Design a protein around this ligand. Sequence first.
Ligand SMILES: Cc1cc2nc3c(=O)[nH]c(=O)nc-3n(C[C@H](O)[C@H](O)[C@H](O)COP(=O)(O)OP(=O)(O)OC[C@H]3O[C@@H](n4cnc5c(N)ncnc54)[C@H](O)[C@@H]3O)c2cc1C
Ligand SMILES: Cc1cc2nc3c(=O)[nH]c(=O)nc-3n(C[C@H](O)[C@H](O)[C@H](O)COP(=O)(O)OP(=O)(O)OC[C@H]3O[C@@H](n4cnc5c(N)ncnc54)[C@H](O)[C@@H]3O)c2cc1C
Ligand SMILES: Cc1cc2nc3c(=O)[nH]c(=O)nc-3n(C[C@H](O)[C@H](O)[C@H](O)COP(=O)(O)OP(=O)(O)OC[C@H]3O[C@@H](n4cnc5c(N)ncnc54)[C@H](O)[C@@H]3O)c2cc1C
Ligand SMILES: Cc1cc2nc3c(=O)[nH]c(=O)nc-3n(C[C@H](O)[C@H](O)[C@H](O)COP(=O)(O)OP(=O)(O)OC[C@H]3O[C@@H](n4cnc5c(N)ncnc54)[C@H](O)[C@@H]3O)c2cc1C
Ligand SMILES: Nc1nc2c(c(=O)[nH]1)C[C@@H](CCc1ccc(C(=O)N[C@@H](CCC(=O)O)C(=O)O)s1)CN2
Ligand SMILES: Nc1nc2c(c(=O)[nH]1)C[C@@H](CCc1ccc(C(=O)N[C@@H](CCC(=O)O)C(=O)O)s1)CN2
Ligand SMILES: Nc1nc2c(c(=O)[nH]1)C[C@@H](CCc1ccc(C(=O)N[C@@H](CCC(=O)O)C(=O)O)s1)CN2
Ligand SMILES: Nc1nc2c(c(=O)[nH]1)C[C@@H](CCc1ccc(C(=O)N[C@@H](CCC(=O)O)C(=O)O)s1)CN2
Lengths: 287, 287, 288, 271
Amino acid sequence: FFHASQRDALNQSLAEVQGQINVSFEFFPPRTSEMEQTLWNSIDRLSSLKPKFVSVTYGANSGERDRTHSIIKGIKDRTGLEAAPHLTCIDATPDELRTIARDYWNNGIRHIVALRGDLPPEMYASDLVTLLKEVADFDISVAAYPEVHPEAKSAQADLLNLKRKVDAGVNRAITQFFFDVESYLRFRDRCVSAGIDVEIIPGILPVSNFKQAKKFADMTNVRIPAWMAQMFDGLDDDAETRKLVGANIAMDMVKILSREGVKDFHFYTLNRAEMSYAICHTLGVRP
Amino acid sequence: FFHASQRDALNQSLAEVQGQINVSFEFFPPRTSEMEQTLWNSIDRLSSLKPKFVSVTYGANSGERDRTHSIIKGIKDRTGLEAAPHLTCIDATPDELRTIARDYWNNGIRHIVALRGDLPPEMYASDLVTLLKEVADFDISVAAYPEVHPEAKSAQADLLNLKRKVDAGVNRAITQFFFDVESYLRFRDRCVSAGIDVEIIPGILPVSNFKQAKKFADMTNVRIPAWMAQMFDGLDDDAETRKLVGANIAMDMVKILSREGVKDFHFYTLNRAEMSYAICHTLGVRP
Amino acid sequence: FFHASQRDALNQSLAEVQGQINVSFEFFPPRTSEMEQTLWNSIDRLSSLKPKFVSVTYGANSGERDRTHSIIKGIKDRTGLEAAPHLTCIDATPDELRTIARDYWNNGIRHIVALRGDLPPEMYASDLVTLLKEVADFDISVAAYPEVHPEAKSAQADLLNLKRKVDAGVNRAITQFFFDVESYLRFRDRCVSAGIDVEIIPGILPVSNFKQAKKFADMTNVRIPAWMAQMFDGLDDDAETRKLVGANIAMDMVKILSREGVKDFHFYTLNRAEMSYAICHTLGVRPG
Amino acid sequence: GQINVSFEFFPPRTSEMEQTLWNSIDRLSSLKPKFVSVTYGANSGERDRTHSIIKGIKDRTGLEAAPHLTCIDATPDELRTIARDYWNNGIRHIVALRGDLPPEMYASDLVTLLKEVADFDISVAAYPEVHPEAKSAQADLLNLKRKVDAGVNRAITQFFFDVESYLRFRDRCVSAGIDVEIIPGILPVSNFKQAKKFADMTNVRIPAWMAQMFDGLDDDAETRKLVGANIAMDMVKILSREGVKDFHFYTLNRAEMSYAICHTLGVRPGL
Ligand SMILES: Cc1cc2nc3c(=O)[nH]c(=O)nc-3n(C[C@H](O)[C@H](O)[C@H](O)COP(=O)(O)OP(=O)(O)OC[C@H]3O[C@@H](n4cnc5c(N)ncnc54)[C@H](O)[C@@H]3O)c2cc1C
Ligand SMILES: Cc1cc2nc3c(=O)[nH]c(=O)nc-3n(C[C@H](O)[C@H](O)[C@H](O)COP(=O)(O)OP(=O)(O)OC[C@H]3O[C@@H](n4cnc5c(N)ncnc54)[C@H](O)[C@@H]3O)c2cc1C
Ligand SMILES: Cc1cc2nc3c(=O)[nH]c(=O)nc-3n(C[C@H](O)[C@H](O)[C@H](O)COP(=O)(O)OP(=O)(O)OC[C@H]3O[C@@H](n4cnc5c(N)ncnc54)[C@H](O)[C@@H]3O)c2cc1C
Ligand SMILES: Cc1cc2nc3c(=O)[nH]c(=O)nc-3n(C[C@H](O)[C@H](O)[C@H](O)COP(=O)(O)OP(=O)(O)OC[C@H]3O[C@@H](n4cnc5c(N)ncnc54)[C@H](O)[C@@H]3O)c2cc1C
Ligand SMILES: Nc1nc2c(c(=O)[nH]1)C[C@@H](CCc1ccc(C(=O)N[C@@H](CCC(=O)O)C(=O)O)s1)CN2
Ligand SMILES: Nc1nc2c(c(=O)[nH]1)C[C@@H](CCc1ccc(C(=O)N[C@@H](CCC(=O)O)C(=O)O)s1)CN2
Ligand SMILES: Nc1nc2c(c(=O)[nH]1)C[C@@H](CCc1ccc(C(=O)N[C@@H](CCC(=O)O)C(=O)O)s1)CN2
Ligand SMILES: Nc1nc2c(c(=O)[nH]1)C[C@@H](CCc1ccc(C(=O)N[C@@H](CCC(=O)O)C(=O)O)s1)CN2
């Protein structure tokens, strides 16, 4: 019984990797008192899993950018975990960036996720990496796109950009979320073929709100397989079933990736802990 | 990428079986006002899925047995669904049984799950089937044990008993719950080899409370694979993670069984709807 | 990676079977002082595995039969395990049989392996079963032949004869040794399909001496699959390799059988403990 | 048979181990291995002991004998003299390694140096579960490719007990454009305690069923040998079914287990 054994094998393999998996969690600046509370609950919950690091997204408005720094600081004080702020090239001059970078370093924040940034309705990520490396010897993470950045002139160019980016001084790449596991695996192979020597860490998005995930997916060129669309069909008013189905999907994904050698996962928590916590548990990442 | 494709294939196959799967739900007599409320909520929730039938377990004490009948009646009135009461050979003479059977039939209850019954601290199931068939032409379901009934002198004898049982006039067999999918598949094959012509419907137990499931499993000779025990290890005080992990397991199980030709599932709901409802959804069984 | 995945699953399921396996060991009356030393050393070793029971073959020689009863007694006293003597219908009147039969029961021997017996150069096993149950409610084990008994006129006829025998009052059947798992599996299915209510316990022969195994098989109608013949080809003078190869085959066999639901094994130890001890170990059957 | 095998031996440090080794060499030589190799240990024998065994094997059996040459605590000039001497004296196959550090040169630098000296047949190490010092799995694979492109005939993998780990690695190698054979290094296990210590030290994973299989056998050598032979024969059977046509055995200087495994593979003496 093929599938029967294959499943038992996969399950047993997953149980045995307990203690070898590195995880990281991504959070975003809360916009309300309610969101803030959820965030700190999630931070405390996930901090007990001892992630290699946690990161905080960087938006464009000034208040939000001041928010990123305060939350990073708040996370460091409260948990003692390495917190990496996301830094973009949007609405910032090289001089402001060097200042922000110098201040981050002097404040004990030596890991930065260097990004170009979403374009609001000049320099590229590689330029930021170079700039940052000139300021200090930062630990740097950058974005990778298994399904190709929607702006790239070609997959070749996008893959080449990643290489250029990595060459400037990157420690790891974190992929855009995906639901087609094979796209990630193939991309990981193409990266080797492109001479990129850093680990390609999959960014995992546990889906609880499909409507919103689909919209984000449609804007980022992320493919939603037909089976997944059918799996969430008819659940617009059933949050409970969506959570169980989404967890099942996320869990199946990390199980397969783990069997393919992946030992690092980055979770897009959307500031909630439940799903990512449970996924990490199946991965053997526990308190 | 083996596992990658195999998974996508399994997932797509599951999506395409939508509308071909028959399901049934098992409930037990509530013992408190709170349990009763949960039950009716679950009944209403699951009734919208149009199960082929629902059943209600039969205990030994007199009040509980009067409970089984009232709940069956309550279910018929409220939903109009076919409700099958479980009937055991415990604390009952052939004459009482014939009376109970005659009264069930005259009351519109023509489907009975015929059982010997758990032994409290004479005749066997096959005897009850024969007795029932003499009273009326009942639609009859009986229990099957993929991992062998703990009382059987041997697997051969237990399998032979099932055949004897089926020969007396059974429409289907429902298996004891299991977590080793291969045991069920092999058993299904052995049943054919034994000349048993009824469908062997898997009884699915969605696990949310592992401690209790393990105890029941240990008493019924049901094996808990090591990977599953590890999956629930450390979750005694985390109901949320247990539910997500349990749903993942149940969902993986019905997905594999479905690919192996199973088109009938019987759920041990434990009077709760959430898990079974979500599992049925992944099976394409929706409102 | 289908072969690999299935292999992992198999090893794992076997790994957690540890504890739910029932094993029994078969011995034969030694014919030399050396053989005796070896036997009791093996009995001591294997006993620490807590076998459900152990049995001793029954020859036709009057003096050797005394050894059968004797050894059973030794085992009984020495280790305290259930020792079931083999009983044949060779050179014995229905009256003598009842004698030793109830003579055994008075000595604490409640389990007997009832056989017709090899015919040295009127009644059958079924007749002996009936004869024993009347003398007392003996726990009885009988022989089964997955590849058909040599004398049987037909597979079906042989199969019905087994039922006849079982329907006479037996608790379990033990198969002639075999090397093709399928034949055993199919036979086991045909058995339930024929209404035989007892388990068909596989008799495992761990092969170290292929030449002698092939000869015993050629006499017992047991098939030596080609792959097995090729596996031992060229090892006539290499006992070490024959042992490793044969241990491998037996471990592979009980692993497949275990995954198929078989929870009972009977080992033809040939009075040696090493191989059977190792196979049991892989089945999770280990000492304290 | 279409199946090729090679055996690995280590320099004996005692009279007893030396006798064991030569007995094994005679036994295994009859299987006509494609080649045999002899490891190196800076503080466990040095180059002279490795060279000695290689010379002995060659004169005694006439088989192709490949020394494991490391480039640690060795200068480029010394390495050149060494290679020259080996070549002029009939040693045309070398297992080029960086060496266990008791960065300088990496194995790829050694491969280049060797090819400059002569057209050696070269074998290098590959790690299905990633070399413990690698920056990442990606980098370790890239470095294998770089090493292979330097002029390698084949790669021999570190031992492993998770067969899928090897299969997945072989596929990644092919996807990476590495065209040489990735020969699985097989370790027949009789002494589990020692194997476990070496594995934990090299990041080789021990499946749960395996550790369970050796549990309670610390003082039972006979059962360990039977159980370990079973594990190895199973492994090579699966690998063989998966298209593997070459096996490299870590004999630990003992022939019984490897000889039997080869037998089950159809690799037998041509008597
Ligand atoms: C893990 C992760 C975290 C993120 N966090 C944030 C966040 O906090 N805030 C936010 O605003 N966004 C965030 N993003 C989104 C991201 O900034 C957008 O995807 C953005 O459009 C590209 O950023 P990048 O760093 O990948 O850009 P780059 O690597 O610079 O690439 C962007 C495009 O330019 C192309 N390109 C590169 N160099 C050249 C060149 N010289 N000429 C022409 N084309 C070129 C590339 O192929 C690509 O199409 C995140 C994405 C990921 C995957
Ligand atoms: C779907 C399902 C629903 C259940 N619902 C209930 C419930 O509501 N209430 C409750 O009390 N229990 C219930 N049970 C549990 C069940 O009653 C126990 O497992 C009980 O021990 C056996 O019942 P059975 O109908 O399988 O018995 P049977 O089929 O009669 O078998 C019981 C044992 O007797 C053996 N046997 C049969 N005939 C003979 C013979 N002539 N001589 C010797 N041995 C023989 C069989 O091999 C077996 O070991 C349920 C089980 C399942 C799987
Ligand atoms: C576990 C095991 C232990 C054994 N131990 C011994 C031992 O210690 N000593 C020894 O001498 N031999 C022993 N044997 C061998 C055995 O006695 C021979 O195989 C013998 O030829 C048949 O014995 P049985 O009990 O199977 O005979 P039976 O079951 O009587 O069958 C023998 C033949 O008669 C046929 N048959 C059976 N009953 C009838 C009937 N009533 N009418 C017509 N045909 C019938 C069958 O089809 C068959 O061909 C053993 C075999 C096994 C597998
Ligand atoms: C078949 C086999 C036989 C062996 N025999 C011996 C023996 O006899 N004696 C002994 O001492 N050891 C031996 N080893 C062990 C080996 O020497 C160690 O694993 C050692 O640490 C690495 O050697 P390598 O030849 O694989 O080195 P390399 O291929 O140089 O790899 C070592 C590390 O450096 C990295 N790397 C490669 N190039 C670069 C670069 N340019 N920049 C940065 N990183 C780079 C790799 O990814 C890896 O982490 C053997 C291993 C195998 C599998
Ligand atoms: N183009 C782009 N890609 C990115 C990110 C980004 O900022 N831009 C960050 C990470 C975003 C991960 C997400 C996936 C789905 C998301 C989602 O559904 N967000 C909510 C909003 C959540 C909130 O309130 O912040 C929504 O779109 O309605 S957020 C990774 N990838
Ligand atoms: N031997 C036996 N087997 C049976 C059943 C049975 O009644 N007896 C009915 C069905 C029982 C299915 C269950 C699996 C796990 C269960 C469980 O955990 N029950 C709770 C009690 C639930 C309640 O309050 O009724 C407990 O054991 O604590 S109930 C199927 N199999
Ligand atoms: N026909 C028949 N079948 C039987 C048995 C029997 O007595 N007769 C008993 C059991 C015999 C099991 C054996 C398989 C191979 C054996 C063997 O090789 N015996 C050695 C003698 C014993 C020894 O090896 O010391 C030989 O024939 O040379 S003994 C089961 N089957
Ligand atoms: N890092 C590293 N990897 C290597 C080798 C090496 O030298 N270093 C050579 C080969 C070593 C193969 C071995 C696997 C297990 C071994 C072992 O247990 N050796 C015992 C000695 C066994 C004996 O010879 O009795 C020990 O030194 O503890 S030796 C292949 N891989």
